[PDB]
Amino acid sequence: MKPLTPSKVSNFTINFGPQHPAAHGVLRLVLEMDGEIIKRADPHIGLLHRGTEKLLEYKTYNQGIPYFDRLDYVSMMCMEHSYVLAIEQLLNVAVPLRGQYIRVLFSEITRIMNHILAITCHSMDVGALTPFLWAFEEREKLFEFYERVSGARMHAAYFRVGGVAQDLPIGLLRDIYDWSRQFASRVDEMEELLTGNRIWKERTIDVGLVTAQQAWDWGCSGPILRGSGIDWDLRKNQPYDVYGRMDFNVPIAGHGDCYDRYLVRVQEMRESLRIIYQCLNEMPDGLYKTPDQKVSPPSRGQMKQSMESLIHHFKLFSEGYHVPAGETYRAVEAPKGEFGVYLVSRGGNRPYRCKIRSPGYAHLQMLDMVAKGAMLADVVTIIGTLDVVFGEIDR
Amino acid sequence: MTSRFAYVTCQKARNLYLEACRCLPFIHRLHKLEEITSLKEMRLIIKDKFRVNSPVTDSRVTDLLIFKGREELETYLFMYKQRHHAITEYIEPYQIKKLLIERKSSNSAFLDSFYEKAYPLVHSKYA
Amino acid sequence: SYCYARKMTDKDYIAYDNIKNFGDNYLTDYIIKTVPKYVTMAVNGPAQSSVLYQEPTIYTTPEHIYALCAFLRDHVNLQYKTLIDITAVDYPERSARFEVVYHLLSPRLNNRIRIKVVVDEVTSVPSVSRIWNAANWFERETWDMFGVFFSNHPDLRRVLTDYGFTGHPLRKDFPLTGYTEVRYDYGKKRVISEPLELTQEFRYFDFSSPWDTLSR
Amino acid sequence: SSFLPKEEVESRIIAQVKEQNLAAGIKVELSSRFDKDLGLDSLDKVELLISLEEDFGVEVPDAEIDKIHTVEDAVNFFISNPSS
Amino acid sequence: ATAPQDFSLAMKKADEIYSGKTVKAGDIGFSAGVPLETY
Amino acid sequence: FKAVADVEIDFSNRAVLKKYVGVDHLSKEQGTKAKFIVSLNSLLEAVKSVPETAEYRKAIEATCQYRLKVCGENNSDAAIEEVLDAHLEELIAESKEELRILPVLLESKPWDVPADYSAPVFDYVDASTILDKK
Amino acid sequence: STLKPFDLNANNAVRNGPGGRSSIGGVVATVFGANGFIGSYVVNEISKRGNQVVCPYRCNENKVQPLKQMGDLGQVVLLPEFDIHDDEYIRRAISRSNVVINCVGIRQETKNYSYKDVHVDFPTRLAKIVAESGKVERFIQVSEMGADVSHASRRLQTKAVGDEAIMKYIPDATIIRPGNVVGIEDYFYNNLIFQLSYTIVAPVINNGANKVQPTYILDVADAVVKILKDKKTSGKTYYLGGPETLTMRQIYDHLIDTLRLSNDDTVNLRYELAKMLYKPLDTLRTKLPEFPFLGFMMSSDYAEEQVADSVAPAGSLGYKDLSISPAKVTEGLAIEGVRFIRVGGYD
Amino acid sequence: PKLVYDIKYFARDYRRNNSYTVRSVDSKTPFDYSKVFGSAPLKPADVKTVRIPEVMPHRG
Ligand SMILES: NC(=O)C1=CN([C@@H]2O[C@H](COP(=O)(O)OP(=O)(O)OC[C@H]3O[C@@H](n4cnc5c(N)ncnc54)[C@H](OP(=O)(O)O)[C@@H]3O)[C@@H](O)[C@H]2O)C=CC1
Numbered sequence A: 001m002k003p004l005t006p007s008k009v010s011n012f013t014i015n016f017g018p019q020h021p022a023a024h025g026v027l028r029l030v031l032e033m034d035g036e037i038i039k040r041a042d043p044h045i046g047l048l049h050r051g052t053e054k055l056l057e058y059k060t061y062n063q064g065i066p067y068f069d070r071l072d073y074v075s076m077m078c079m080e081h082s083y084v085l086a087i088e089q090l091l092n093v094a095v096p097l098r099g100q101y102i103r104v105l106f107s108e109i110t111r112i113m114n115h116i117l118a119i120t121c122h123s124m125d126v127g128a129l130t131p132f133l134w135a136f137e138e139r140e141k142l143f144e145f146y147e148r149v150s151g152a153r154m155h156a157a158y159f160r161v162g163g164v165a166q167d168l169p170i171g172l173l174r175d176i177y178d179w180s181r182q183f184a185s186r187v188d189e190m191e192e193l194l195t196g197n198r199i200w201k202e203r204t205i206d207v208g209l210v211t212a213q214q215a216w217d218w219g220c221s222g223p224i225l226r227g228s229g230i231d232w233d234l235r236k237n238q239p240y241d242v243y244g245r246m247d248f249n250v251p252i253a254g255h256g257d258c259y260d261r262y263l264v265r266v267q268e269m270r271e272s273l274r275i276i277y278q279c280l281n282e283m284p285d286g287l288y289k290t291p292d293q294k295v296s297p298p299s300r301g302q303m304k305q306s307m308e309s310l311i312h313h314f315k316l317f318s319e320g321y322h323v324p325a326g327e328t329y330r331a332v333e334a335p336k337g338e339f340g341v342y343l344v345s346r347g348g349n350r351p352y353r354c355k356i357r358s359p360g361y362a363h364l365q366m367l368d369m370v371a372k373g374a375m376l377a378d379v380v381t382i383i384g385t386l387d388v389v390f391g392e393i394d395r
Numbered sequence B: 001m002t003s004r005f006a007y008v009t010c011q012k013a014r015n016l017y018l019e020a021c022r023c024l025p026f027i028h029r030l031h032k033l034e035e036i037t038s039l040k041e042m043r044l045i046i047k048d049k050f051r052v053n054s055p056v057t058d059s060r061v062t063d064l065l066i067f068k069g070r071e072e073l074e075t076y077l078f079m080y081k082q083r084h085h086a087i088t089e090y091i092e093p094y095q096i097k098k099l100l101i102e103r104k105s106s107n108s109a110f111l112d113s114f115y116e117k118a119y120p121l122v123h124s125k126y127a
Numbered sequence C: 001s002y003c004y005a006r007k008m009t010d011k012d013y014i015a016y017d018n019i020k021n022f023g024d025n026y027l028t029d030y031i032i033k034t035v036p037k038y039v040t041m042a043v044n045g046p047a048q049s050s051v052l053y054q055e056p057t058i059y060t061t062p063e064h065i066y067a068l069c070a071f072l073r074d075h076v077n078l079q080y081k082t083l084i085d086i087t088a089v090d091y092p093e094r095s096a097r098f099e100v101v102y103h104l105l106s107p108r109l110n111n112r113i114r115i116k117v118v119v120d121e122v123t124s125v126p127s128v129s130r131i132w133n134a135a136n137w138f139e140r141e142t143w144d145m146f147g148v149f150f151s152n153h154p155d156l157r158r159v160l161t162d163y164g165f166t167g168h169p170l171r172k173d174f175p176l177t178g179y180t181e182v183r184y185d186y187g188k189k190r191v192i193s194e195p196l197e198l199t200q201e202f203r204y205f206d207f208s209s210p211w212d213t214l215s216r
Numbered sequence D: 001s002s003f004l005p006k007e008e009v010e011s012r013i014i015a016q017v018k019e020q021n022l023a024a025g026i027k028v029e030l031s032s033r034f035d036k037d038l039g040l041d042s043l044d045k046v047e048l049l050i051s052l053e054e055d056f057g058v059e060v061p062d063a064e065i066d067k068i069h070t071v072e073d074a075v076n077f078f079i080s081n082p083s084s
Numbered sequence E: 001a002t003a004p005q006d007f008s009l010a011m012k013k014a015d016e017i018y019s020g021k022t023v024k025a026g027d028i029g030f031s032a033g034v035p036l037e038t039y
Numbered sequence F: 001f002k003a004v005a006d007v008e009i010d011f012s013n014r015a016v017l018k019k020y021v022g023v024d025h026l027s028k029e030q031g032t033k034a035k036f037i038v039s040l041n042s043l044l045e046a047v048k049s050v051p052e053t054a055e056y057r058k059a060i061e062a063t064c065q066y067r068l069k070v071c072g073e074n075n076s077d078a079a080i081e082e083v084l085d086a087h088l089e090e091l092i093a094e095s096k097e098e099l100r101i102l103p104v105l106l107e108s109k110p111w112d113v114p115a116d117y118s119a120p121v122f123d124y125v126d127a128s129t130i131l132d133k134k
Numbered sequence G: 001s002t003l004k005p006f007d008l009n010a011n012n013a014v015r016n017g018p019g020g021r022s023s024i025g026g027v028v029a030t031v032f033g034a035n036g037f038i039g040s041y042v043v044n045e046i047s048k049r050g051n052q053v054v055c056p057y058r059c060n061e062n063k064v065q066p067l068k069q070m071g072d073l074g075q076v077v078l079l080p081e082f083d084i085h086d087d088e089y090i091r092r093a094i095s096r097s098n099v100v101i102n103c104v105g106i107r108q109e110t111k112n113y114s115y116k117d118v119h120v121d122f123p124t125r126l127a128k129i130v131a132e133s134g135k136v137e138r139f140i141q142v143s144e145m146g147a148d149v150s151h152a153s154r155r156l157q158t159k160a161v162g163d164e165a166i167m168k169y170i171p172d173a174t175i176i177r178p179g180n181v182v183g184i185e186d187y188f189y190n191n192l193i194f195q196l197s198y199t200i201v202a203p204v205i206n207n208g209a210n211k212v213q214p215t216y217i218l219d220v221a222d223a224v225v226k227i228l229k230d231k232k233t234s235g236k237t238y239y240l241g242g243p244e245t246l247t248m249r250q251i252y253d254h255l256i257d258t259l260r261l262s263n264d265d266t267v268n269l270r271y272e273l274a275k276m277l278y279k280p281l282d283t284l285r286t287k288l289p290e291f292p293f294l295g296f297m298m299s300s301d302y303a304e305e306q307v308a309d310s311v312a313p314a315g316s317l318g319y320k321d322l323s324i325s326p327a328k329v330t331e332g333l334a335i336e337g338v339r340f341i342r343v344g345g346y347d
Numbered sequence H: 001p002k003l004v005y006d007i008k009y010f011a012r013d014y015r016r017n018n019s020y021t022v023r024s025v026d027s028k029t030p031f032d033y034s035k036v037f038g039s040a041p042l043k044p045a046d047v048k049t050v051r052i053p054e055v056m057p058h059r060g
């Protein structure tokens, strides 16, 4: 004999289509909203699924490296790095120290551009356009280093099994060092416009709140973990190159809101600058690729002077190396999180199965939990902090 | 509270078809297909889609097929697929078949395929 | 458990000695002895975490996967709080074609574990979404690419492939180019799908040597 | 319990039954099992019930669909039901 | 002929431990979802 | 680690640290030593349902005994944190997380296996070991 | 269904493939008037089946943009500068072609080109040029149904004279004579709608008595394919009328119904009055450039062709001889285009 | 480079020299918890740490 209480109903099943001030790529987002507040978000993906994983199965191991560069167009080096590390683990190949240094250096460089693009495109999505243009000039300076080492500004394909494709051109280390001398001042200029700004604070504070338990449950990595209070970095917890030698501190925040992750990314840029300076000063001298010529191509004079080297060149550029039967999962700290490749080999010259673990796939899965109770405008900021790349999400 | 007077899925596909038939008007209104096609006309196509999978008898394969057919229905119902998809894949071929006039060929099936192509297994487009 | 930042300075260590030893050499034996019914076989091989270490691989059956995953996440000594990914590999030579692979992380142990469930096309694998929320999309992808059904999944739908796609592309019997192709027609002002025609066919180059031995 | 005349509803149901490809020829009347006299398939039976749904503006329970078997049974079901 | 004594050992062992459930011939082809003219 | 906040705070206060890194999200309780002792003893009481000659029960008993010892010699609550590599709050949440899976383990009873149970284990031998020396 | 060959000599050698875009069809076609409404669909049908289509066009890159998508690489050849008076260009266009389709026509006169040039001189000149070659095997000319030598309208009379000239030079040519063609880019329903909606009053010649047999564009395009797939069709004129014969009043009423116009805006501009209102405006047209304001509807020729019954003669070839069932133009997909405008649940 | 005039791949062949051994584990034999927790520290002083590997293996 006590009255029951009824409730309310939600409608407005909107479709948020491909939208330019958002994370780059095409996003189709179906949102159920009670009034102006979202109740469910269902991201529709597959709009950039190019069948990469199945295409890898039909190519040789060296022929499949350019796939990883194009999986993530912002951070190419980190993406191909995991593939070459997995092949190296299965092949039992040891990388010379100079090549290990070159890999760590360029990995930090691509990390820096990734963070620059992420922060300034997020500010553009908010509506501030000056940091964005102020950033493209820096990103051009770093693309110039890429075009110097590889001849391609974006899809270098520079990392190879056992080392790097070519050696560093003379004069590169000086130029990188000059860009480093001025980088901190440029970053401070960007930081003043974003940090301390009342409108930016209001837009980003307490938006997209994540807790450490939630991050581990949903499989998140990188800035999302470190903005919530988790002292976990693969470069430190599970080193994969001469990163162990390198001296740098993990940036940690605790709130988990959008602002905390932005601050983490800026500090990550600074830590990457420190790692680059250490790489520049301690760069060794010697071989840049593995001495073994049954897994690495011989030098051109050597193929033109030796019969064994011509044989090795012919059989490596036609058949490729044979990877011993086995399975491995090698992960690297990509700028967007943890990127890993699960490679299955049956003993042939082609991969049998190459699963790609997307750091952004789990973040897009986390979108629904994060964007609950938010508004249509908050979705853009939340997408910005996830920093999702849909060619990277859709393999 | 007691007296002596007191107390005195082989057809899973049928249920899925019933679900499709009951959901047909909703997809007609959602996909603006009222004028182009009738409800009965679409109800006819759905049976042929069901009949293609008749030979299977294993229960587990039947379960998988039913789940996939439910997915096909859900795509139209949830607006994943669009109006032009419905036109292209269901309504247009059914209307084309009705409008088709053909001469009853006196040549047997072998002669016609022999005249047509060397390898009968290869498909023909725009027949 | 959760690697909440505790030490402000001098946390140079990768981990403690005891935590490393228990997971470097006792982890598989500990799992087998503690939960014997779940495990059928175990493989210690090249480590997922690193080149120098060794990480376990555990083979279990589909019925025991949920309980094994629940044990792995919440056991005090073994805290695999994270599901890195879920994957399937198609082996047409085997009667049980598909091998569903689970990759986990223990932040406390700084270790990686791999769990394999071997199934066929008809059998289903119980969903582990209640143990790890990240599983939902991974199992949806496994269903899309390989056709492995996951039981008690909240909503098992295709993710990557086009709407109306019925085949499972990553199956080894699926053609690399597929069966259909997409073109716009002027007559019918619609984008339509048609059977495949290739202007230039894919050229498979057979590079295998008779003298090779690594091929298994 | 016949809300509307038995002759009218019967003529209408047999009119819809004729629309199906078979269920005709020499015997289209009462006392004809859908699947054992008329050659109808189960899906065709369900569609026929949906066509009767359109004709008489009233729904049929699925368990009743398990119970319905004959031309007599369907007309009996529709006459019994007040909405008709 | 002796033994590979490598990953193939665990490969064969996974083969002999596990097995597939029997189904009628051709039933899986319908589950595959490819055009039926393929068969 | 490095704080990403321009504001200056003291991380040796051992409470400002916890507030900064967000341990309060894990548990609103303070997480003292006595709470850890109580949680470990409650886990010991809980694992009584598992049969006495079960390897899992022996494992939980050994771990709880080790942690009760570590509480024993160390009178400082921070010292327990250093030895166990964890905040006291998450150490306490650990035993509850163990409590959560006891029902699932008592439904399937993994410890029941036949007296001929044998789990084959395959181990990888690296060539670097053999090539360099024997 | 079994694919039927294009009945062209030595096709069996050259043809190969399933019959799709990437397949090889042994038909090289020079379609004059490709960028037009009728020509574009014919180009689409021929090129869809793997054949090569040469499309001479008067310089206009944006108008011929859709034809670029029609075929695979190298199949649709677009020749930039087409003039009806240039013999050498016509010879170059049909050099490799074994079928030639002429869809070149003008609805109205201008200062540069009159009916007698386009509808008479060009067919005769092209007929001579095609005849001298010999490689061209099939010739198809597209004309109106109502075209007759004894017709009041100058357009429909010149078209028939040009068709007779074509028949004289090439005896094996096929004269396709479709009715008012309905399509998305048609000039029938689109002009009627523009008349009903953006014009002060909709003048209807007489009371809409004139009977017409409208046909859908896809049906005519398929009919062209069926003409080319049979050599027995050569030398015959096919009156491709629609499935239903309708008076103009019915079509106006049904457009008003489908668009859900408030009421009937059509007025009775009976004949003998249009013959006085538009008669000077024809002389106006012949001395002025192309102007969007007035055209087609606002001519004495249109009034003269809307006082007669443009219907197929009783004894005549049609869609049935080509084994095609024409689709109704008042229902179904044909009428979707007008349907999108308004259906009363719309706006 | 000491490989110019001294060529021996079989000595430097790590790819094809990997192998897999086999063991059988049984539930009857108890696990050695003495190994796991006997070496575990009981006080802060006894804590021992594993340093991060500085470089990955190289042939030199
Ligand atoms: N309602 C219809 O559509 C019907 C059409 N027909 C007949 O089919 C033919 C074309 O139909 P339609 O396509 O609708 O008419 P269009 O005017 O739409 O197509 C005319 C084509 O001829 C070209 N053309 C016209 N005059 C010249 C010229 N002086 N020199 C060079 N090229 C020229 C045009 O090119 P540009 O664009 O540069 O002028 C255009 O490509 C006409 O003869 C018409 O009577 C038959 C039955 C009904």
Ligand SMILES: CCCCCCCCCCCC(=O)SCCNC(=O)CCNC(=O)[C@H](O)C(C)(C)COP(=O)(O)O
Binding pocket: B010, B011, B012, B013, B014, B015, B016, B020, B027, B046, B049, B050, B051, B053, B054, B055, B056, B057, B061, B062, B065, B066, B068, B069, B070, B072, B073, B076, B090, D042, D043
């Ligand atoms: C516009 C939206 C359209 C949606 C289209 C949806 C199309 C779905 C197609 C899926 C087809 C299936 O499920 S096929 C379901 C599995 N196929 C089987 O054959 C199992 C048992 N089959 C039979 O009993 C008979 O073949 C049968 C004729 C089915 C009699 O159905 P009943 O068991 O009752 O007697």
